[PDB]
Amino acid sequence: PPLDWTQDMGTPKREGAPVHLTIDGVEVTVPAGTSVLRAAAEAGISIPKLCATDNVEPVGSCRLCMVEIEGMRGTPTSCTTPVAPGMRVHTQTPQLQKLRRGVMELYISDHPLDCLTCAANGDCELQDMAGAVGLREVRYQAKDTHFARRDATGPNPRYIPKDNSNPYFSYDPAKCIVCMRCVRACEEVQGTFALTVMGRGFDARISPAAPDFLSSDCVSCGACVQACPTATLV
Amino acid sequence: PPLDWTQDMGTPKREGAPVHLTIDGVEVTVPAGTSVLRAAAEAGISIPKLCATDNVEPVGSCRLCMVEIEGMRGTPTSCTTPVAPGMRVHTQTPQLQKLRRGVMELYISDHPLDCLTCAANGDCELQDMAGAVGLREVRYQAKDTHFARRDATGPNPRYIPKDNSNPYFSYDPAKCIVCMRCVRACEEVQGTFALTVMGRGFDARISPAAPDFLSSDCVSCGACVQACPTATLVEKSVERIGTPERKVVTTCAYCGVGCSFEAHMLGDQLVRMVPWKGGAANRGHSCVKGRFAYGYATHQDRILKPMIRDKITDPWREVNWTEALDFTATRLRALRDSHGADALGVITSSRCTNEETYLVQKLARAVFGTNNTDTCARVCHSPTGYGLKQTFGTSAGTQDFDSVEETDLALVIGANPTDGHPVFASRLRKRLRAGAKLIVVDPRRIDLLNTPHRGEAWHLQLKPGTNVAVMTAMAHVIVTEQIFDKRFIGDRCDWDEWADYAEFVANPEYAPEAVESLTGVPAGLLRQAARAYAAAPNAAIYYGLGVTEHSQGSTTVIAIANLAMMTGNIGRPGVGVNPLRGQNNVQGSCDMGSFPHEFPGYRHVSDDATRGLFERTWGVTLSSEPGLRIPNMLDAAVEGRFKALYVQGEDILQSDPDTRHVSAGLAAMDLVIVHDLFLNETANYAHVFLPGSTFLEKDGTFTNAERRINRVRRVMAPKAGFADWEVTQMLANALGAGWHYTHPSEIMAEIAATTPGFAAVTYEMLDARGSVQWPCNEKAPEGSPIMHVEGFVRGKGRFIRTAYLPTDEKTGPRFPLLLTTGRILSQYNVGAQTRRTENTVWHGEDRLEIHPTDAETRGIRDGDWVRLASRAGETTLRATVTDRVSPGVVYTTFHHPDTQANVVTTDTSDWATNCPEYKVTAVQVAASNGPSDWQQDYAAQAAAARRIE
Amino acid sequence: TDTARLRAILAAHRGREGALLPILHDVQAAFGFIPEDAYAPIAADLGLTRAEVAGVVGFYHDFRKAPAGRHVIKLCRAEACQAMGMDAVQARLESALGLRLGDSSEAVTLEAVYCLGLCACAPAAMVDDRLVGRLDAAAVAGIVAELG
Amino acid sequence: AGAYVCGEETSLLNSLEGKRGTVRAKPPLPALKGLFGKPTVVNNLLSLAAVPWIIAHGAKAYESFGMDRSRGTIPLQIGGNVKRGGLFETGFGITLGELVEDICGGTASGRPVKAVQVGGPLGAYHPVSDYHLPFCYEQFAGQGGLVGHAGLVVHDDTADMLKLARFAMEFCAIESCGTCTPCRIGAVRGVEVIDRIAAGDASAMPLLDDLCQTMKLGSLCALGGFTPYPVQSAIRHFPADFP
Ligand SMILES: Nc1nc2c(c(=O)[nH]1)N[C@H]1C(S)=C(S)[C@@H](COP(=O)(O)OP(=O)(O)OC[C@H]3O[C@@H](n4cnc5c(=O)[nH]c(N)nc54)[C@H](O)[C@@H]3O)O[C@H]1N2
Ligand SMILES: Nc1nc2c(c(=O)[nH]1)N[C@H]1C(S)=C(S)[C@@H](COP(=O)(O)OP(=O)(O)OC[C@H]3O[C@@H](n4cnc5c(=O)[nH]c(N)nc54)[C@H](O)[C@@H]3O)O[C@H]1N2
Ligand SMILES: NC(=O)C1=CN([C@@H]2O[C@H](COP(=O)(O)OP(=O)(O)OC[C@H]3O[C@@H](n4cnc5c(N)ncnc54)[C@H](O)[C@@H]3O)[C@@H](O)[C@H]2O)C=CC1
Ligand SMILES: Cc1cc2nc3c(=O)[nH]c(=O)nc-3n(C[C@H](O)[C@H](O)[C@H](O)COP(=O)(O)O)c2cc1C
Ligand code: SF4
Ligand code: SF4
Ligand code: SF4
Ligand code: SF4
Ligand code: SF4
Ligand code: SF4
Ligand code: SF4
Ligand code: SF4
Ligand code: FES
Ligand code: FES
Ligand code: FES
Ligand SMILES: [Mo+6]
Ligand SMILES: [S]
């Protein structure tokens, strides 16, 4: 049976002419607009991804699906990089390994180590992409965080308390990576723009324009939930 | 297929009557002793477990597999609770949930939250049982911990720093839960009690009685690792590289046991190799070499492009395929027209698959137009295939390795399974510790004798060479007395011959009381051992190179089979005459020709009925005359009338005797191709070179000692671009044959078509069944786990009169001592694959196990340099004083080339198959400083020849 | 000379059933502790492994890993002896010798035993193989007097 | 060799075998497979001291003394702060009221008794109010307690129940094979929890109760299954000492 059913490919399916390419030394034939990530998925060669889901269109936020492509400069993303004929792409080099480790380092520098007593243990797309890439050390002695209730000199202003107003799911932003799948889903899939991103940068926090989800335009449907990898929305 | 393969059930499988029960409202029928946990597993209802594994027996340590059972009080464990009929058990109530949460709470109260930057993330059996049960809060403000470096008031005394002394795995006790699977495995499974639990209670820490693992009795084998759930014991390749995603089943390129593995892969980078819980050969166990040593395939010294010289003194020249093959075939045809087709030859590699083997022998017969092929088996277990052929009808084993489980006695002649065949020795020790008995006939105390919790043991520490005398005396004892089985003789064997044999053996000259002089073994001990062997219900013989590699190997093997037939220990699980084959696909190789006197199927070459079949199948005229053997090749080429040679996957220099002679014979050869991975000692005299492929890059099969055909899969991609069968057909087509193969499945098909036994063999079968024993025709479709189960192959066994011929390698004044060559666990034969790994730790230099009293008068001390002044050469080596060996005996190892050991070794060989006398050589060990005259020149040559341009 | 004694001990417990414990007892009685130099031969004789031996040694408390002082003082810390004022005794004694509980020396070694059968004669102790009871804060003077 | 846990049959016969006193699980009983895999009959001294007397003087005579279920004489050992300590062998049915106030007088210090600990440290702290409680396995097992080797110590008003309840876990901690988790860790954690209670925290008592419960239900041997009784008893009988 299809793979779309059991496996979460990266990007949506596209229609077009057949196109041949070589993912990590493996021949693949797929429609034109189809990405590198989906193709690599179809070919069995898995690439590290956190912000890419089939339900929605891809966005280069995690930067963890970087690959070396012959004829390109640097380490472009597979989520955003549509295939082309005769394209030869490499999926795992030392460089990419280093970069991905660095990115996860940055992520986890702002994440709590509540695995092993978090709800989404065994089902977090962050944990398994942190073990995949091969993270073993975090070097940033962080001071500015979102999870820490108590900073130095007092309470953390960045800390946003949980929101269990909804009787079916809960929002703990302490564990939010800003992949924005939640937003993308409520806006592309469902179609009721109840979620947005309040802020510019590190101060960027997901939020419905209201004190709580319930008060919002959010009805339910756990698309936001089905897509959150990191137990923030659970 | 079975569930045992993919899923880790709780407890081992038990045999017994069927028993019906209701696990969580689901009916299950399983053997009696079988636990609740395993049953629940079989039924799909999973129960939370951390300390329970199938490899071992269960222990109620975690307390997380608690269940409510009707008719019991409290919350008993499933690991320890055997089923009973009409039992109704509940698996998930509120109570149990609470308790399990509490237990995990306690666990994690003493665990670091380094998930998300721990090695075993995604593969920790603690993490996933902490999310399963539903842990969400820890309430204990802990002060006493093991992980915390810094406590209050100072450092933590409880903190034990990491231990990376081992180059393959690491021990971080900070994350230890004390499930003790590690211990249980090293003690139940492997059988070397290297691990224990130091302390009482919270202070209980796993530990080997030593500063570090390396210093310990721990060899390797990552059973301890395969079982640790919590990254405490972890493979380093998983620390560096990430945790893997996919798995691919393969086999080991070693040892002939056929220890099946599943290679864990993260893309195309090989992270690790872990046993599969399949193959009757290995039930989830291994050794160091297979588990860890797979790094030769990624060494800088590996060669990836063809090279041609046109003269050995001249340097190499990195070259593409086409012109290389052109040059090759040109020279070949030239020589074939000049000196004749019989002036060519090949040398197959057991290390290779059976497919490539078949192709090579074809290349040698169909193309070149000769029968001059051979392989490594001339020197390992050729006499076997003569004796067992003259007696039974097959040049192959008799039983599986699962048979030993049912034996009540083990007689071991010429073997050291702890080093040679580790995974077999494990299963042997498992049985020894369970009451079975042991007789050992080596002159060299082996570690099988000093196994822990051993039952009874007899040791016949004899003088090397005198191996048939002892057997004859055993038989003399058995016949003088009346212990043998008459029913068996009358039924499955002949009687006319039994009488003659008895009348021969019954002679008092072959009695233990006389041989004691020349043999060195006592008399009473021998009598006792014989009585014990003859008395036991199910006894089994496992022999190796102590019998074969001698001037009387075939004779000895025959004597052994005679004993086995006399006593009645044949044609049943638990008994037999098992030779321990060595290299992988030695059996496959010999089965697919690779002998100069036979075709695939051990069918002689002079058989017109077979030659016709093959002429028809290959569409070419074949020869009826048998080809040369390696020694014959070399003598010829020295004398002439032999000019070519296609050496596949074998080092004819370091791994063959009378090194001087073989070198002089290899030099006088206008062409000697090589088809290895690395630049071997053989390539120092070469004109051509072709890269090969490792078992990781290949695809095909391996036929092991128990005749099992394990399947080999492709995980990596050939770095040189082409595997070995590809290269072979390249060469053949370049010569003019014209084969067209795109996948070795086609070849296996060809084989099934030509030779009998493999007619039912198909890759799909191997994939589904898991494995096959090669006698698999329309008759015995599943396979033939045991040979001779119903009458022998020739129809009737044959009794043969064996006698002890005094060897020609006797000792004298200038060569007073003897010599023996053998093995080590860490390193393989020449270590081309293994010296290029981190196993140079346990063994980085070859050493000489000399006896003290035989050293004192010489002035030897441990760590001193000595010389072996033998007849056929001379060599320098570092010494090691040990009471392991008997006085007047010496033991060496040939794994390292820096030491040239087979130069000492002499040309003397068996009478039938011409297998050499490795295990006997009159030598003179003395003290010296200057290394040698030979080693210098050798290094000079090797240095002036391994240079590229 | 230690090897000889050890061999003697091992010979004395030959053929016995589960003779590890007795052998260790005797080895301890001989030297005063189980030296790591004597983990191996025991195993060699009994067919065990160094590990099993060390584990046994580690589990049980009565097998010394390092030697004690010239004198030894075991002091119950159990229920009963606690009831009739063991704490005060302990305090006085550890003030006298200046050695707290569990802390040893070359001179003495104060430790706990957790019962002696002197549950009526509640405050109890074992000083150098001699039992003492009814240890009020006075007898401690005599305890220390015969014990420097 | 100085190990309380070796009082358990399995550990005992493990220690006989030359191994380390780790308790075994009980799919097989020692009677079926004990010492060296052989059938073995393991018993207490008192149970083997009555055998000769029984078979000799007649079983029926031994069957006379005692209660309906508990038959024969039992020794009551009486120690700690008590005037007349020692041993008292008698038929069951006698109250500790009599045995502690009438027979054995009162206390050495002359003070009253606040506690009486039947059984060892695996046994509860019965106060004076339970003087209406005759000795027998059944009534004592049912009245939140235990009678094993009939141990009996005494404590006067100058005792601190906190200290004792702590010593209990400290015992279960220092005496522990270290095989199952609820005595390895549970104990050395309870000893911190009790300290927290001593401080005054209120997030401890329920924690303590849950701990005790999992130790009861989960632990493999009694030493980590009976350990909670002292604690819970000292807490529910003597609340004036546990803030
Ligand atoms: N780790 C590891 N595994 C291996 C190998 C390796 O090198 N390293 N080698 C592989 C191969 S190719 C081989 S052949 C196989 C089998 O290899 P084995 O069958 O294990 O042969 P060896 O270990 O050389 O020695 C067998 C024993 O017999 C002793 N012996 C010597 N002379 C006599 C004699 O006259 N009579 C008797 N009764 N005994 C004698 C030898 O000294 C030694 O103790 O193992 C395979 N497995
Ligand atoms: N003194 C003494 N001499 C002995 C013995 C002894 O006990 N003592 N034992 C004898 C016996 S038991 C035997 S088996 C021989 C074995 O001795 P060898 O014939 O040396 O066998 P190996 O050590 O496997 O190495 C053979 C070569 O093939 C290469 N190779 C490995 N895998 C592959 C592959 O997949 N494809 C290709 N194309 N090449 C590959 C290896 O790298 C290596 O260079 O030694 C014999 N000589
Ligand atoms: N979770 C917990 O709190 C646990 C507490 N305990 C308790 O500890 C107390 C005493 O400890 P044990 O002596 O270890 O157990 P036990 O009291 O159940 O066994 C009594 C003695 O008789 C023997 N025996 C038991 N059943 C037998 C049978 N069917 N046939 C023949 N012999 C049999 C045993 O070998 C043992 O020596 C018991 O009351 C038990 O309930 C024991 C296990 C766990
Ligand atoms: C921690 C612990 C300590 C024990 N100590 C003893 C003891 O000292 N004496 C004893 O007879 N039973 C003791 N037992 C009980 C034994 O398990 C077993 O029941 C007893 O030895 C059998 O004797 P019986 O048949 O006379 O009861 C102890 C049990 C446990 C769990
Ligand atoms: S969201 Fe995922 S990574 Fe974060 S704490 Fe929970 S399980 Fe761990
Ligand atoms: S659950 Fe609410 S917020 Fe989430 S996608 Fe649905 S409507 Fe939007
Ligand atoms: S709430 Fe979940 S899906 Fe939305 S940005 Fe945060 S982690 Fe991503
Ligand atoms: S061992 Fe398992 S639970 Fe412990 S830190 Fe590592 S991944 Fe997490
Ligand atoms: S690797 Fe093998 S031998 Fe070494 S400690 Fe682990 S189980 Fe024992
Ligand atoms: S080292 Fe691993 S297997 Fe051994 S007790 Fe610790 S966690 Fe268990
Ligand atoms: S025992 Fe032999 S076949 Fe098995 S892994 Fe080791 S070397 Fe390979
Ligand atoms: S409760 Fe303690 S002493 Fe008893 S079996 Fe468990 S760990 Fe061992
Ligand atoms: S991985 Fe394609 S951008 Fe997130
Ligand atoms: S789960 Fe059966 S005891 Fe560990
Ligand atoms: S309690 Fe210390 S004497 Fe028994
Ligand atoms: Mo071999
Ligand atoms: S071999």
Query: Considering only CA atoms, which residue is closest to atom 1 of ligand 8?
Result: B230
Give the helix/strand (H/E) hosting B100: helix B94-108
Is the CB–ligand 1 distance for residue B446 below 6 Å?
yes
Residue B568: closest CA among B596, B527, B540: B540
d(CA D210, CA D204): 10
**B53 alpha carbon – ligand 14 mean position (Å):** 9
CA dihedral B660, B665, B670, B671 (to 10 degrees): -80
- Neighbours of D, requiring at least 3 CB pairs below 8 Å, are B, C
- Entry resolution in angstroms? 3.2
* Ligand 10 pocket mutation pick from B50, B64, B182 by most atoms within 8 angstroms of CB: B182
Task: Dihedral sign for Cα C53, C56, C59, C63, please.
Answer: negative
How far is B566 from B577, CA to CA, in rounded Å? 12
End-to-end CA distance of chain A: 30
SS (H, E, C) A36-71: HHHHHHHCCCCCCCCCCCCCCCCCCCCCCCECEECC
CB contact under 8 A, B267 and A92: yes
Phi, psi torsion values for D90, nearest 5 degrees: -160, 170
d(CA D124, CA D155): 13
Name the token pair of A34: 């189809």
Rounded Cα–Cα distance for residues B396 and B577 (Å): 10
Residue nearest ligand 14's atom 3 by CA: B60
Contact A55, A4 (CB under 8 A): no
Question: Inter-axis angle of helices D181-199 and D205-218, to 10 degrees?
Answer: 160
CB B659, CB B653: distance < 8 Å? yes
Residues B56/B189, Cβ–Cβ less than 8 Å = yes
What are the structure tokens assigned to B840, written together? 């140079």
Cβ-based neighbour number of residue B755 at 10 Å:
23
Q: Quick check: D147 and D140 in contact, CB under 8 A?
A: yes
Q: Are residues D150 and D77 in the same domain?
A: yes
Rounded Cα–Cα distance for residues B693 and B678 (Å) = 10
Compute chain C's Rg from CA coordinates.
18
- Cα-to-chain-centroid distance, residue B589: 16
The CATH number for D99's domain is 3.10.20.600
Q: Do chains A and C touch (3 or more CB pairs under 8 A)?
A: no
Q: Which residue has the tokens 């003597």?
A: D238
Pair D1, D11: CB distance under 8 Å? no
Q: Is D81 on the interface with C (CB under 8 A)?
A: yes
Domain region containing C109:
73-146
Contacts of residue B940, defined as CB under 8 A and 6 or more positions apart, other chains included, come to: none
Nearest to B553 by CA among B802, B877, B259, B837: B802
| Interchain proximity B192–C49, CB inside 8 Å | yes
SS3 A127: helix
CA-proximal residue: ligand 12, atom 2 (nearest):
D183
* Domain assignment of residue D226, given as a range: 161-237
- With CB atoms and an 8 Å threshold, state whether A133 touches B242: yes
Q: Please give the Cα distance from B296 to A128 (Å, whole number).
A: 30
Q: Specify the length of chain D in residues.
A: 243
Q: Which of residues 108-147 of C touch D (CB under 8 A)?
A: 113-114, 119-122
Nearest one of B28, B491, B431 to B191, comparing CA atoms:
B431
- Asked whether at least 3 C-beta pairs link C and D within 8 Å, the reply is yes
Nearest 5°: phi and psi at B473?
-70, -40
Handedness of CA B936, B941, B947, B949 (dihedral sign): positive
- Count of CB atoms situated within 10 Å of the CB of B240: 11
Which class for A160: exposed (0-12), middle (13-18), buried (19 or more C-beta within 10 A)? middle
Give the whole-angstrom CA distance, residue B701 versus residue B725: 13
Q: What is the token pair recorded at C55?
A: 């584990």
- Residue B99: strand, helix, or coil: helix
Residue B714 to residues A22, B291, B645, B750, D13: CA-CA distances in angstroms? 19, 17, 29, 21, 53
What is the dihedral sign for C-alpha B753, B759, B764, B767? negative
Q: Cα separations (Å) of B199 from A104, A147, B141, B205, D176? A: 40, 39, 24, 6, 10
How do beta strands B88-90 and B68-69 pair? antiparallel
Cβ–Cβ under 8 Å, residues B702 and B251: yes
Nearest Cα neighbor of B390 from B784, B793, B791 is: B793
**Separation CA B186–CA B285 (nearest Å):** 11
Residue corresponding to tokens 């060897």: B807
Residue D63: Cβ within 10 Å count: 11
Q: Which of B109, B174, B110 is nearest to B140 (CA)?
A: B109
- Report how far apart, in Å, the C-alpha atoms of A13 and of each of A5, A37, A66, A82, B355 are: 13, 11, 20, 12, 42
- The whole-angstrom separation of Cα B710 and Cα B752 is 16
- Which DSSP string corresponds to A198-227? ESSSTT-EEE-SSSSTTTSS----SHHHHH
H-helix segments, D109-160: 137-142
Contact assessment for residue C128 and residue C136, using Cβ atoms and an 8 Å cutoff: no
Stretch (H or E) spanning C53 = helix C50-59
Q: Which residue has the tokens 């109840």?
A: A194
DSSP-assigned beta bridge partners for residue D136: none
Compare CB distances from C80 to D16, D79, D171 and report the shortest one's residue: D79
Half-sphere exposure of B706 (CA within 13 A, CB side): 26
What tokens were used for B809?
């390698």
Beta bridge partners of B916: B909
Nearest chain D residue to B36 by CA: give it: D27
CA C147 to chain centre: 17
Ligand 7 pocket (Cβ < 6 Å) reads: A 176-182, 206, 227-228, 230, 232-233
* Backbone phi, psi, residue B577, to 5°: -125, 90
| DSSP per residue, B258-289 | --EEEEEEETTEEEEEEE-S-SSS-SS---HH
Helix (H, G, I), strand (E, B) or coil at B350: coil
C-alpha–C-alpha distance, residues B433 and A88, integer Å: 58
Counting beta carbons within 10 angstroms of the beta carbon of residue B426, is it exposed (0 to 12), middle (13 to 18) or buried (19 or more)?
buried
Q: Alpha-carbon distance B580 to B600, whole Å?
A: 21
E strands of chain A, at which residues? Answer: 19-23, 26-30, 68-69, 88-90, 196-198, 205-207
Beta bridge partners of A21: A28
How far, CA to CA in Å, does B681 sit from each of A169, B338, B838?
A: 69, 29, 21
Residue in B664, B634, B596, B686 with CA at minimum distance from that of residue B368: B596
Query: Angle, to 10 degrees, between the axis of helix B468-480 and the axis of helix B554-567?
Result: 20
CA distance B123 to B244: 9
Q: In whole angstroms, what is the distance from residue B671 CA to residue B642 CA?
A: 10
The answer to whether D217 and B99 have CB atoms below 8 angstroms apart is yes
Rounded distance between C-alpha atoms, residue B388 and residue B394, angstroms: 6
Question: Shortest CA distance to B250 belongs to which of B288, B221, B220, B291?
Answer: B291
Q: In degrees, to the nearest 5, what angle opens at C-alpha A144 toward C-alphas A138 and A148? A: 85
**Nearest protein Cα to ligand 6, atom 7:** A218
Task: Say how far apart CA B152 and CA B81 lie, in whole Å.
Answer: 43
Among residues D159, B708, D88, the alpha carbon closest in space to that of C85 is found at: D159
Is D131 in contact with D116 (CB distance < 8 Å)? no
Query: What are B16-23's contacts with CB under 8 Å, separation 24+?
Result: B19/B83, B19/B84, B19/B85, B20/B85, B20/B86, B21/B83, B21/B84, B21/B85, B21/B86, B21/B87, B21/B88, B21/B89, B22/B87, B22/B88, B22/B89, B23/B89, B23/B91
CA B461/CA B442 separation, integer angstroms: 6
Ligand 2, atom 13, lies closest to the CA of B380
Q: Give yes or no for a contact between B364 and B371, defined as CB atoms under 8 angstroms apart.
A: yes
CATH number of residue C110's parent domain = 3.40.30.10
Tell me if residue B504 falls in helix, strand or coil.
Answer: helix
**Candidate from B102, B110, B204 with C-beta closest to D214:** B102
Task: Tell me how far apart the alpha carbons of residues B677 and B668 are, in angstroms, rounded to a whole number.
Answer: 24
| Ligand located closest to B462 CA | 1
DSSP reduced 3-state for D183: helix
One-character DSSP codes across D58-101: -HHHHTTSB-SSSBSEEEEEE-SS-SS-EEEEEES--BHHIIII
Q: Is B876 helix (H, G, I), strand (E, B) or coil?
A: strand
Ligand nearest to the CA of D117: 15
Rounded Cα distance, B882 and B16, in Å: 48
Q: Which of B795, B771, B768 is nearest to B783 (CA)?
A: B771
Supply the DSSP symbol for D222. S
